[PDB]
Amino acid sequence: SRTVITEVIATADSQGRFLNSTELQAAFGRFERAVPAIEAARALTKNQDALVKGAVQAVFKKFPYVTQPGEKGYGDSNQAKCARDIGYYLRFITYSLVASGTGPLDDYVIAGLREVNRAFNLNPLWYIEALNYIKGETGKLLSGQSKTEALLYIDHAINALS
Amino acid sequence: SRTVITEVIATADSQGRFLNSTELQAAFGRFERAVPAIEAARALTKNQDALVKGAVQAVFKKFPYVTQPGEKGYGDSNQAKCARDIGYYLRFITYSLVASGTGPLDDYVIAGLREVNRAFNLNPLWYIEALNYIKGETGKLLSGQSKTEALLYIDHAINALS
Amino acid sequence: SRTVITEVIATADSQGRFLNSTELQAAFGRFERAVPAIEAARALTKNQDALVKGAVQAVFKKFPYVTQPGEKGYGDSNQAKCARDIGYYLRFITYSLVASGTGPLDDYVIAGLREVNRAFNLNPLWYIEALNYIKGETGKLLSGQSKTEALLYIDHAINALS
Amino acid sequence: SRTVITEVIATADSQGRFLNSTELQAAFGRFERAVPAIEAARALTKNQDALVKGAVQAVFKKFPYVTQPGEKGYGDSNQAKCARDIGYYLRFITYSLVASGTGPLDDYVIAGLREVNRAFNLNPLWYIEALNYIKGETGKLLSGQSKTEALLYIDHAINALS
Amino acid sequence: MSRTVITEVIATADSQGRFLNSTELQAAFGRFERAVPAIEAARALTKNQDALVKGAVQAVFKKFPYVTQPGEKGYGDSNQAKCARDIGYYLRFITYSLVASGTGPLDDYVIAGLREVNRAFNLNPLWYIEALNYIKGETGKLLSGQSKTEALLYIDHAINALS
Amino acid sequence: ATENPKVTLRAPFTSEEFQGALYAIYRHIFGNTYVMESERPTTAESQLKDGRITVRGFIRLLAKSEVYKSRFFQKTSQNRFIELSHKLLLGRAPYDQAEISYHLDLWNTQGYDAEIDSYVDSEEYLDFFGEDTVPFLRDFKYQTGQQGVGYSRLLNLYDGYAGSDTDRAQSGQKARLNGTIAQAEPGSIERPSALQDTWKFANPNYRNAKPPMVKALALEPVDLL
Amino acid sequence: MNDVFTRAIAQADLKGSFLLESDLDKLASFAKEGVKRLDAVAALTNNAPAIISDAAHKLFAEQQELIQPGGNAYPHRRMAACLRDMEIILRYVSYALLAGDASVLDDRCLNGLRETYNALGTPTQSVARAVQLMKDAAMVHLKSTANVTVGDCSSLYSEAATYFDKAAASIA
Amino acid sequence: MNDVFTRAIAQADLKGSFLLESDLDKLASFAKEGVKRLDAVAALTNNAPAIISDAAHKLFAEQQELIQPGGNAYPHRRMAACLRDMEIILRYVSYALLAGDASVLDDRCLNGLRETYNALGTPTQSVARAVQLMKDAAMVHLKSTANVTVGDCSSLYSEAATYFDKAAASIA
Amino acid sequence: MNDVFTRAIAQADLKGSFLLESDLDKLASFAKEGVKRLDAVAALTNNAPAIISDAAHKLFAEQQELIQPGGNAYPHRRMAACLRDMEIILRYVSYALLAGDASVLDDRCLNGLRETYNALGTPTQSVARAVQLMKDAAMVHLKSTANVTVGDCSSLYSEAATYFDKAAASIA
Amino acid sequence: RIYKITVSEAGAYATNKHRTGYRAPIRQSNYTLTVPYDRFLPEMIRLHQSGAKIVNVTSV
């Protein structure tokens, strides 16, 4: 996936050249960023369940009409799919934090997202609200540099939803 | 010129996208590496006279025939050309250190280097010996990671010549 | 190879058409010059050994330092490879005389010449000196249009080296 | 315009190289075949009126239906146009002889031939018969290589017509 | 392969990656409305084919009195018999175009490669233009209305190609 | 298909952009074959650097050069040439036998350069590459004008990142799609040998049912109840 | 790509004579029913999102291994690819329905499609199942008698069924 | 591409040696007879439409099946293709006759032509027959004594026949 | 093309699972040894001309048949392609060394290399020998204590050895 | 002969790009294309078909 190391290697390769000093400094920056990013991944993995259930409840609070019958969020199966989707998003955010790139989000979430949302009439505002709750909670589960990394990736997902 | 910020902007721009986590990680790595690089630039700037004089002398030691009549090292104009060229190499190396990238060396030295040397019958091995002397003397001048930064740039120049 | 008959046929083939009068007049010129060119090729083949010995000696005369220990010409293997290389150049000059075209020289020497000379650190000036000796010595031989025929190809090789 | 010397220059111009032994030998063939081509041009241009009138009468013989009323040959202006056109063909064959290339015929007759011959209902077999007449006369007005030159260019025009 | 109204419709929609919208169905409805006069013209031409072939051969002979003479293309029984064969080919490709409501059969069988084959075998396109003008004349005697119009348009396309 | 970026070159550019564009261009247009320094076109890229020609004009020049002709024309059938030119100039494989007929007739009547211009002046080339981006293999992702056979045929034409279209094969420069395009068959999807170890544990044919060792019969009421 | 008329013309040309009276009667009848044919093609065109949503929902109900991690429709990219393929195959089926022939479908759409799916690791049997479900939804929409003059169209339903079944058989 | 000279050069290079005096004498003989060779090539070039028309006339006299409906030269498109293939093969035989080596014919014209014809459905036997007919029609023009110095040119006849035979054997 | 991180991510995704504690520990250990990895990659990059030079010298001393007329490195064009191949293999080995995964080699460097060499008739055993000589020359520059901090980098040595062996084994 | 055609893309080109889409990156409005004589007519026909408007044509 498109991560710092992979971009480095692929850009150098498509230009038929070795890895220069700039590319190695990018790699060094990635290796330094690994510590806060992996600690943030640890924090979001540890608290995944409360995070996702709170995010689903936040979605239902901002979008009360959804739970009523005849629309998307009525019924146990639909809400279970909701929790599964937000779990997917959180999982891929943690993958991005580990890889230090938007690669996993781009490959697994961002690509083809709008077409799927139109095909199944899934409103992106739902997922944006869930990610906003995740953002608010990771503001209280992390601190310092890890907080900034997690926020970076969550905002990346939000910006690509809107 | 090819710098870390340059590669960031170019890669994010060709894909028509805003900057993101991987790109800012590379920029952070560059800004972190800046301090040893500017340290090395200051160190090489203070010792340009001794470094260039010693490099010229090392070239004449390694290729004595150069100084004999009928060859390239005969005449004070040619000696001044030699010292001038080595001063150019050192100056562009410090430029590379400051910009944190092989951009200056690439644009101002490497591009066109082969055909220029072929046209004027300049032997690359002369410049490789000069740069090897400078590489040796950076160890006695620099210590830490500044030495490593200077060495990657000098080795880049040497590889470009080789 | 790209000999006169071959660009004749290649142009006709590219243009999707038969051979017209221009093509056949070029071919007639080839068949006309085929007599001095084969006379020259025969003379060079007959004097190959003396030409190679003299060329190697001239190279060592213009570049004495090469034969010094620690240099590319020191030893027996290196000088044997020198004679091997000069025999190669002479052989392909005779081929290009016979074929009436620089095709053999372009395909067996000139293509890949710079890369190879660079990797193995072979000075093209050695080979230019040896080819100039070949030129001088074929001046003594080959009175007439055979002289011009041979010198065109020797100068083509020289220009490729420079 | 397409001549031997023109292709000589154009190949090297495409390849970005100086003219070489191959192209120089082709030009030599052109220069040596100049003299019978110029002699053929002299013979063809001296006898132009007789050839034109004989060719017009040959066409009217081979195609008797052309002369009778309602056709392309009934009319003094039409027959003047006939003489004009056959003289055009003769002049451009002389040009091709002089240039040692089919370029004047290619540019001035062959290009845009069938479209206009169709738009004006000019049957190409008329001009084929006229050119065969010119061929039969040039069989006697010429001898040796000039005969072959004129025959080659007349045959080129004929094959361009059919 | 054959440039029929349905075919340009479908190929156009396909090059744009879209379904057949209202305009394409407009065109298709038009073609299906053509097909009554067009099929009637095809039927009339198929029935009257033999007289058309004989008359076209004769009209070419009259318009080119010399060709039948010895030493020329029209001389010989085989040459005239497969003159008739060629005129039959042209007539049934005209019927094909009428049925398909497109020059596709004409463009694909006779028109493509027409000039090179004529040149190689030294056949004057004017002979065939004369035969087609003859059939164009007989069309008014055999057809009427839009059926006449369609047949005339296809014969005219064949002539313009031969021109 | 996914990792190498589409290389685009505009009127003003720096040194590294220019050099990388040239590397990508030479690695695509000349197949994956080694182009020696003596073969490198200098005036064409000087005109590209000036802005006299676009990247499209540079592609046109290169496809008309003796490198391209010596590799993909002079020792080939016309079928092989048309396959190669579709792959390298249009980023796809020929879809129909009519395309081969069209291009063979175009070269026979109007010459080689009219053929190259038919490739580069085509609306398909300009739709996908315009004047500034280097041509890339483009049928590995679905596009508005693709056909069922296109993916398979491009896969047949593409020999891997370390493979190339070289005349220096001992068997020569041979057409591989000449029999399949005529018969309207798909291309071959056999990939190189270094990819056998990749993702071994996937089970795409999961729904497929394993047959029984012996078909069950019903002797008394018939043998399929 | 040829229609019913060009098919008849090619068959006549192979034997090398005129279209017989029976052939012309067939083709005139086809053109007479072409209005109903246009209605059927409009039914397929206006209801494509409905048909493909229905087919996708049924397909991922029957086959859950497709939409779960590791499945071939798992991430949005491959899910979008799946729905795109459904769009494409429905599009070519409607093309063939308008043409009155399945030459456009076979030649342009389904010819290397099994080879593509086999090279990508896509279950061709699942694709065939999706085409069957999409045929069923399409046949529900084709039979709709609202907004359109009532009359027999059984031949059209059978023909659309053959086009979908041929697509399925070609993929699987 | 190879002429006789390049073939000799490649053969000598494989063993890594200068060309022998015998080889130089053979190439000198080739260059000496180059003028007769040029006349032969001009005879082929100048009479190509005649050669091809004669060959096509005879071929379609022998083989009516080609020009019948359902035959492989029936419409003007396939007939144009037949004539074009004849002219291309003749062109390449003339190229080879000029070069003295059939490498151009093998590489460009005959590289994959048999299986291309098989895939198309072309009777390779009839193509070989057409190449034989062009050989016979061309031989008449090669032995035309008019407009040229008289001499023995039997070797050129043999070589041209060998190139025609090589084409006819590679095709079928 | 994957690094170690994206390989771990793909495995976890196949499980449908967040990365485990132990997986994150192994990944943080990889990223903490990162500077030694960078020094090793820089040692490969900076000494590449020396590596290819001495590897080629040893190879053409051992296998003289490669540079004989008729060998596979004989003309300058073949020798230049040989040196380009050695350069490329070393470059991709350094890519793999930085990535920590050998996915770049089989995705890119060796994607069709064996088929290429079999088509060209290159002796794959000589290419394996060349890659082995490049491994031998590389190990001297990797182990060089000069001008870097002293520490244990033996795992990097083993990893580079495995990458070189993978290239050699895929070629041969 | 060589012809320099200064073309400025306009709303007729903008609508075509809005329908078809940018398979290639967006570029500025006005630019010059240098063509030979042989390509001149196809170049003009193509620019007209795409909706692009020529500012002018100069010879050289």
Ligand SMILES: CCC1=C(C)/C(=C/C2=NC(=C\c3[nH]c(/C=C4\NC(=O)[C@H](C)[C@H]4CC)c(C)c3CCC(=O)O)/C(CCC(=O)O)=C2C)NC1=O
């Ligand atoms: C430089 C090369 C060149 C050629 C060869 C050429 C031929 C030529 N002849 C023409 C007229 C004509 N040419 C003829 C020739 C016929 N007269 C009969 O006695 C014969 C059967 C036959 C001649 C063998 C006739 C009848 C016309 C007038 C008919 C018409 O314009 O449609 C025209 C139409 C414009 C005009 O001149 O009035 C052209 C283009 N033009 C060129 O620019």
Ligand SMILES: CCC1=C(C)/C(=C/C2=NC(=C\c3[nH]c(/C=C4\NC(=O)[C@H](C)[C@H]4CC)c(C)c3CCC(=O)O)/C(CCC(=O)O)=C2C)NC1=O
């Ligand atoms: C993915 C990166 C990549 C690789 C790996 C690659 C390898 C590669 N090597 C090639 C040729 C070659 N490779 C070699 C090298 C071998 N022969 C000698 O015996 C040596 C023992 C040995 C090298 C150590 C030679 C000699 C050729 C030229 C073959 C010929 O011209 O006949 C070619 C054919 C290109 C052409 O000739 O136009 C490729 C594609 N290309 C790539 O883009």
Ligand SMILES: CCC1=C(C)/C(=C/C2=NC(=C\c3[nH]c(/C=C4\NC(=O)[C@H](C)[C@H]4CC)c(C)c3CCC(=O)O)/C(CCC(=O)O)=C2C)NC1=O
């Ligand atoms: C790898 C990344 C990935 C994601 C994120 C993803 C989301 C996703 N969710 C889906 C279903 C769904 N998802 C939802 C989510 C809704 N439930 C309501 O309670 C909420 C308001 C709301 C969520 C905030 C619903 C209702 C469905 C069922 C829609 C249907 O009827 O098909 C579907 C359709 C396929 C299926 O039936 O399972 C996708 C593709 N798929 C992926 O492959």
Ligand SMILES: CCC1=C(C)/C(=C/C2=NC(=C\c3[nH]c(/C=C4\NC(=O)[C@H](C)[C@H]4CC)c(C)c3CCC(=O)O)/C(CCC(=O)O)=C2C)NC1=O
């Ligand atoms: C014009 C005719 C035409 C068609 C129809 C066509 C289909 C097609 N489908 C593709 C991929 C795909 N197709 C599917 C759909 C299948 N997999 C799911 O499991 C379902 C069971 C099933 C659909 C019901 C999927 C998931 C992919 C992506 C596979 C991958 O990328 O690994 C691809 C590869 C390129 C791409 O990813 O866009 C093509 C070319 N191409 C054409 O030129």
Ligand SMILES: CCC1=C(C)/C(=C/C2=NC(=C\c3[nH]c(/C=C4\NC(=O)[C@H](C)[C@H]4CC)c(C)c3CCC(=O)O)/C(CCC(=O)O)=C2C)NC1=O
């Ligand atoms: C924009 C393209 C277009 C459309 C949409 C179109 C529809 C159309 N349908 C018609 C009748 C009809 N339409 C149908 C078709 C229906 N029968 C069953 O209910 C089926 C559900 C369904 C088709 C599968 C039938 C049976 C008729 C009556 C027969 C006839 O008049 O042709 C008519 C003739 C006038 C009428 O009787 O109302 C038109 C114009 N024509 C067009 O040019």
Ligand SMILES: CCC1=C(C)/C(=C/C2=NC(=C\c3[nH]c(/C=C4\NC(=O)[C@H](C)[C@H]4CC)c(C)c3CCC(=O)O)/C(CCC(=O)O)=C2C)NC1=O
């Ligand atoms: C696809 C439809 C098609 C057409 C139209 C067609 C025409 C046609 N007619 C031919 C023969 C011929 N055609 C003619 C011309 C006719 N004979 C004379 O009585 C008349 C003056 C004149 C017609 C008005 C002649 C004289 C020949 C035999 C001589 C030759 O073509 O070389 C030939 C050469 C092959 C052969 O039949 O032997 C073709 C291609 N062929 C086709 O496959």
Ligand SMILES: CCC1=C(C)/C(=C/C2=NC(=C\c3[nH]c(/C=C4\NC(=O)[C@H](C)[C@H]4CC)c(C)c3CCC(=O)O)/C(CCC(=O)O)=C2C)NC1=O
């Ligand atoms: C540059 C060297 C070269 C050649 C010559 C070549 C031949 C060639 N002949 C072709 C078709 C053809 N070739 C022929 C000719 C044959 N059929 C007739 O019956 C005769 C027996 C015989 C000629 C004497 C025909 C009729 C076609 C059309 C086949 C078809 O459409 O089914 C085609 C496919 C293009 C098309 O369909 O028009 C090629 C590529 N390919 C090459 O790369």
Ligand SMILES: CCC1=C(C)/C(=C/C2=NC(=C\c3[nH]c(/C=C4\NC(=O)[C@H](C)[C@H]4CC)c(C)c3CCC(=O)O)/C(CCC(=O)O)=C2C)NC1=O
């Ligand atoms: C512009 C293009 C061009 C052509 C066409 C050309 C042909 C050419 N043919 C020649 C003679 C000749 N030509 C022939 C060939 C003929 N002998 C038999 O009659 C055969 C039927 C026939 C074989 C095709 C022969 C045998 C000679 C005599 C050469 C000699 O005795 O050495 C000569 C020598 C001068 C002379 O005729 O006195 C030339 C230059 N040269 C050119 O520059």
Ligand SMILES: CCC1=C(C)/C(=C/C2=NC(=C\c3[nH]c(/C=C4\NC(=O)[C@H](C)[C@H]4CC)c(C)c3CCC(=O)O)/C(CCC(=O)O)=C2C)NC1=O
């Ligand atoms: C067919 C065309 C062709 C040429 C021309 C050619 C030359 C050539 N000579 C070489 C070696 C060499 N050649 C020389 C020549 C030097 N010896 C001294 O006496 C002189 C000053 C000087 C020559 C004038 C030397 C020293 C080497 C060994 C270089 C090394 O091993 O690093 C090499 C490197 C591979 C090897 O060890 O054989 C090549 C490629 N090879 C070819 O395939």
Ligand SMILES: CCC1=C(C)/C(=C/C2=NC(=C\c3[nH]c(/C=C4\NC(=O)[C@H](C)[C@H]4CC)c(C)c3CCC(=O)O)/C(CCC(=O)O)=C2C)NC1=O
């Ligand atoms: C500009 C690109 C760049 C490079 C090249 C780079 C290398 C680099 N090498 C380092 C030390 C080191 N370098 C090595 C590697 C060497 N040790 C020897 O034994 C081996 C021969 C060899 C490889 C095993 C080791 C073992 C260390 C100390 C380990 C550590 O720093 O934690 C350090 C940390 C210095 C310290 O904290 O004391 C850096 C940053 N950093 C960069 O940003």
